Write a protein that binds this DNA or RNA. Structure first.
Ligand SMILES: Nc1ncnc2c1ncn2[C@@H]1O[C@H](COP(=O)([O-])OC(=O)C[NH3+])[C@@H](O)[C@H]1O
Ligand SMILES: Nc1ncnc2c1ncn2[C@@H]1O[C@H](COP(=O)([O-])OC(=O)C[NH3+])[C@@H](O)[C@H]1O
Ligand code: NI
Ligand code: NI
Lengths: 519, 506
RNA sequence: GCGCCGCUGGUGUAGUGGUAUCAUGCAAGAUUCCCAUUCUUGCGACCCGGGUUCGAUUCCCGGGCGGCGCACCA
RNA sequence: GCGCCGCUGGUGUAGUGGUAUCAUGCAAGAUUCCCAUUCUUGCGACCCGGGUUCGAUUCCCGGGCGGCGCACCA
């Protein structure tokens, strides 16, 4: 704070220096941007405990165990293109599934599925075509042609949003002409980046989950907002940024009423995003919501930024883009894209009975790749004893493998019990990994922990020797383990994977494991 | 034997799917799935994951759609679907050939026409990666290549042991000349593909016994040349007779049948056709075909691709793609060395699922019209795949019903049961029609007995039969949920619950 | 792609060189109280561009889309 | 994109104008019987194309990819 104070002051001076420069585009918010960048960097350099991940170790684990890899690596690879392996894909679908329960099923959102191929007039209308050609000229989008030859120039969608806007009329009709409603699409988006860098952070193809919440401007207040009002989270307002200030933990309700956040609709989604991101493993102490300043924005915009080894990175944008995309496409195509509400008292010799409503749009955009990479960092740990033993503390709900089945030895008496358990878990819908390899139980614990297997069932000698056949259940993080009846462990593991019990509750109900005594 | 027009009218009106970019004129071969269609699709995909990936512990991966040119050159897709064409130019780089064609003054070998300079004719979607344009690429025409190119790490993930299977679910692109017939011929469609890697020595599947008893229609190549029609056979009994080459092909054929059945394709309008030697390399191929108003269409293609995929890519990149297994004992010019393991180049069995066609088949196989009203159309979607498991319906717009609607909906949501609430203006029969139309599996109706009787009970209605029972509102979510998971059927419900003889109040 | 015929509210449908009929659907208010009830009101359309014309939804051309056929079908 | 430095089994790391070290990982056999145990054996690598050369993983041009810094960031 002693080293940061002068840089804070500096940002502040050039801050409302700018406000003065317009109080009565020569002006350089570029100068302001530089100063804040300095402050940002040095605050970052001052903070580490070191509190932060050994990126090279974590990337090694991800690589070795095929969480994700360079696409076409066998052909030399293509910059900015990545494939997800078994664990990567599994973790992804879990993150997407949780996203579906958290947003779509919760708010009864209308999820649609649109083509990635997009004709040129659509993107010229939204201004994507005009805004992303550059200095021979090269476009930051992927251009292609549809059909015969070059009869129809098209692009790969840069975003998922436009498919919703263009289907507004049938979406609205499906909600029977009533506002408000929301549509969503989960799919891939394409950015022909001139320089893909930092692994999954900036890629040329990535999976995006987008939501367009359509709402009557006359009615921009969310009914469920007090479900998130008392949440305390870090906010970084435009005022705070230009004041040279840092982020500040506030109450959501306060920030909305004080007017820091425009409305309770935008606020609701900020709160819901917070709840979601933390649910999938992102750390609250390493998560902030940063408002967009004047030189980056639309009524209001807030990015969700997570602190990583690469610094602060946006993982979820949440914009208020009242009227535009609906209006822009409307004029472009001459097709009216609006809602209507019946006037109470009918009304320029025409008598009106309804008034047309141009809906406002609230748009949360989720970059699942970055969200996933953030989870990787925020859940990566190294065992205190063995530096080779690394593991991921994935929340049970998103852990790719909920369980592992482990005979204590390659010994044969265990094998029928192992077969029993796998099929049982398979019929309980419980994702599991069976390891009956030549390695010791410690080696195979290490393998399983490495990919974030939530719990480990170990078949021992007392599984076969004593009257009630009982295996041990092991917690990935604490490495502590209990003992329970093979009959019921698939139910117990299923429960932990769904979040209907916690490991503390399990340790409470079932006896602790002091050790083998049959041998 | 369906009214395809009427069905498609329903699909269009309730936004199952639609022409992509319709308000911009539209683009042929491109379709956007609306809420109900998307929902149905997701259930189809999840059922697929449960039926295959989870059941066989398959390694599912997720690759990019952008594919560099050399990859598709190797697999042969370029030299067959990407070329300039006089009709055709290769017979004898870019428009460098146009000069060559004029320099040697090549008229057509037939008819001797003067013809045109070669113009590019891409059946694939070409594009350029990077800012330079030094890296031409295509949208993948299939999801298999991502699996083949990551074979080493997949094998390593299975600790080097064969056999193992990998799968992928994503979009694939084909720049069709003439997109037609709705979803049956599109330019972009979601595909589910499995690559089952097996030791050529042991081209078997231990779990074939689980499907051997299935009676299904088979249409072998030797029966196609004869002219005779397809025969209903025991799946096990196609295998000892050598009609089906091996237990691996047999197992997947069985599993494909059980899946297509489970999602609602009618067993009588489903057959498996063996590819003839005329249409092939590859060891053997059996397509799953379904009977539609467009005829017999291929919706799942089960192929046997001995080696090529792994071998071609290996030879192309000079990167060996093999499994090794140990020998019983070390064995021994060109011979002087000691061997301890032998290399195995995996044989690949490939079930290929076209989700769009599968879904369209379900549409035609579950579309029905009520016996009284010709406006009342509905889909008999199986509960486990139906886009909306349940609907909440107040008998009227009276305020007495509203609080029960609100409570039951929230209950359903917390149980995860996907539901739709129709408390709008219309009558009860209207909202029944409205919800049957999109194939809502079951309908909960809140009536006057619900508000005026000692324990609060509502009715649960079956979409198909239109019959209904009565159970209390606390019970219904668990009931509907168990119907959706396939735990119970309607028979079970009518056995445990009182049939609805009419309301005694109001 | 090549050939023919087409494109009118969300869905159908009538009509025409002077900007459009009527059903259905949805909305509102009544009615009704278990299977698109009935009444009244309201909302919503000539695929797009160009040509000819004082004026085009209508006539000519082109593009887009559609239906059928031939062609191709990783 | 520009700039600078890099690319050796799945991972990490020596080394060289005559095709390569040692760990780690996996496999097999023993060992051990609750936290990468131990011994033996086996498997697997010079990013790719062209050139120079009797011969290149090594030297030289080009390409791809990676790590950074600056840009840009729907
Ligand atoms: N090149 C890239 N690579 C990976 N992820 C990206 C990306 N560009 C954006 N994202 C992620 O996708 C989200 C949306 O990106 P965006 O803000 O550029 O687009 C939109 O918001 C669409 N209106 C971001 O919040 C970010 O997490
Ligand atoms: N143009 C198209 N439109 C919709 N679905 C298609 C399609 N082309 C192929 N499919 C679906 O994809 C599946 C596989 O197609 P294919 O046989 O051309 O490719 C293969 O051989 C898989 N390697 C088919 O069974 C079909 O269901
Ligand atoms: Ni029409
Ligand atoms: Ni290496």
């Amino acid at each position: 704070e002693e080293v940061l104070a002068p840089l804070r002051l500096a940002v502040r001076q050039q801050g409302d220096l700018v406000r003065k420069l317009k109080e009565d585009v020569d002006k350089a918010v570029a100068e302001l941007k530089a100063r804040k960048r300095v402050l940002e960097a040095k605050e970052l350099a001052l903070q580490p405990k070191d509190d932060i991940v050994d990126r090279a170790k974590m990337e090694d684990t991800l690589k070795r165990r095929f969480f994700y890899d360079q696409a076409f690596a066998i052909y030399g690879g293509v910059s900015g293109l990545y494939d997800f392996g078994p664990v990567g894909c599994a973790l992804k679908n879990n993150i997407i599934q949780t996203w579906r329960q958290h947003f779509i099923q919760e708010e009864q959102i209308l999820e649609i599925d649109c083509t990635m191929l997009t004709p040129e007039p659509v993107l010229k209308t939204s201004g994507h075509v005009d805004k992303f050609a550059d200095f021979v000229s090269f476009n930051l989008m992927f251009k292609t042609f549809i059909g015969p030859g070059g009869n129809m120039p098209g692009y790969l969608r840069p975003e998922t949003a436009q498919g919703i806007f263009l289907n507004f009329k049938r979406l609205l009709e499906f909600n029977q002409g009533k506002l408000p409603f929301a549509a969503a699409q989960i799919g891939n988006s394409f950015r022909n980046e001139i320089s893909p860098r930092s692994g999954l952070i900036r890629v040329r193809e990535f999976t995006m989950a987008e939501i367009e919440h359509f709402v009557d401007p006359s009615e921009k207040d969310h009914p469920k907002f007090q479900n998130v009002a008392d949440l305390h989270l870090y906010l970084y307002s435009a005022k705070a940024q230009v004041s040279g200030q840092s982020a500040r933990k506030m109450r959501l309700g306060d920030a909305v009423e004080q007017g820091v956040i425009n409305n309770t609709v935008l606020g609701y989604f900020i709160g819901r995003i917070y709840l979601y991101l933390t649910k999938v493993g992102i750390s609250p102490d390493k998560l902030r919501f940063r408002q967009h300043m004047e030189n980056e924005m639309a009524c209001d915009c807030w990015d969700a930024e997570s602190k990583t080894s690469y610094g602060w990175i946006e993982i979820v944008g949440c914009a208020d883009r009242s009227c535009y995309d609906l209006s822009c496409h409307a004029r472009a195509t001459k097709v009216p894209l609006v809602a209507e509400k019946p006037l109470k008292e009918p009304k320029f010799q025409k008598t009106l009975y309804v008034e047309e409503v141009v809906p406002n749009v609230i748009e949360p955009s989720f970059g699942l790749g970055r969200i996933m990479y953030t989870v990787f960092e925020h859940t990566f740990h190294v065992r205190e004893g063995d530096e080779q033993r690394t593991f991921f503390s994935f929340p049970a709900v998103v852990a790719p493998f909920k369980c592992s089945v482990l005979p204590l030895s390659q010994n044969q008496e265990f094998m029928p019990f192992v077969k029993e358990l796998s099929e049982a878990l398979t019929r309980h819908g419980v994702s599991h990994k069976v390891d009956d390899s030549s390695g010791s139980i410690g080696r195979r614990y290490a393998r399983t922990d490495e990919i974030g297997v939530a719990f480990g069932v170990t078949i021992d000698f007392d599984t076969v020797n004593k009257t009630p056949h009982t295996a041990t259940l092991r917690d990935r993080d604490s490495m502590r383990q209990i003992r329970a009846e093979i009959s019921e462990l698939p139910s117990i593991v299923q429960d932990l994977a769904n979040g209907n019990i916690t490991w503390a509750d399990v340790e409470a109900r079932y006896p602790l494991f002091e050790g083998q005594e049959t041998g």
